[PDB]
Design a protein around this ligand. Structure first.
Ligand SMILES: *[C@@H]1O[C@H](CO)[C@@H](O)[C@H](O)[C@H]1NC(C)=O
Lengths: 49, 51, 34, 49
């Protein structure tokens, strides 16, 4: 679920943590935590990184 | 040839078969521990009731 | 910018009979045989 | 283990064989065999393919 919620915005290295390509603050931590995260705001931010 | 598990290999530049012993040997230890658990026979002693 | 997941553990538990391997360390054990 | 060892550098076609974009030599084969491979050195070579 966190894999498909992050999608292309966070390609995971797989050492137990996900690497976010874009900016994800405390509020974005909380949004992923209560599974309301939408990556439509940060898809173009994280695509070119 | 790796046991009751295995990771056979095929390449395009270095063709040949290898074996991932790291998880395979743990798997064989699990199966043989299961085997020694179940094939362990009980200590109950039946007697000759009927003739 | 990273996010991490997992679970917990305890310092001491109890080794429990299991189908696969006898004596698996668990995080908590109860009693079934009084 | 193979999935997050090889990452986006090696894609999947549907057979179990991995389409590594880098020319994986014998040392690369041994390195991805014995859990030594790192994505950071070869993601630049495997990004454009
Ligand atoms: C562990 O199990 C025992 C017995 O059910 C219980 O009394 C105890 O509160 C449990 N402790 C934890 C941390 O779950």
């Amino acid at each position: 679920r966190v894999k498909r919620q992050l999608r292309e915005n966070a390609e995971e290295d797989g050492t137990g943590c996900f690497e976010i390509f874009h900016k994800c603050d405390d509020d974005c931590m909380a949004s992923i935590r209560n599974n309301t995260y939408d990556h439509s705001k940060y898809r173009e931010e994280a695509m070119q990184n | 040839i790796d046991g009751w598990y295995g990771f056979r290999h095929q390449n395009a530049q270095g063709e040949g078969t290898a074996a991932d012993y790291k998880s395979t040997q743990s798997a064989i230890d699990c199966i043989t521990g299961k085997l020694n658990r179940l094939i362990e026979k009980t200590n109950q002693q039946f007697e000759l009731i009927d003739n | 910018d990273k996010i991490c997941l997992g679970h917990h553990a305890v310092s001491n538990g109890t080794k429990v009979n299991t189908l696969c391997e006898r004596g698996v360390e668990v995080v908590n054990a109860t009693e079934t045989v009084e």
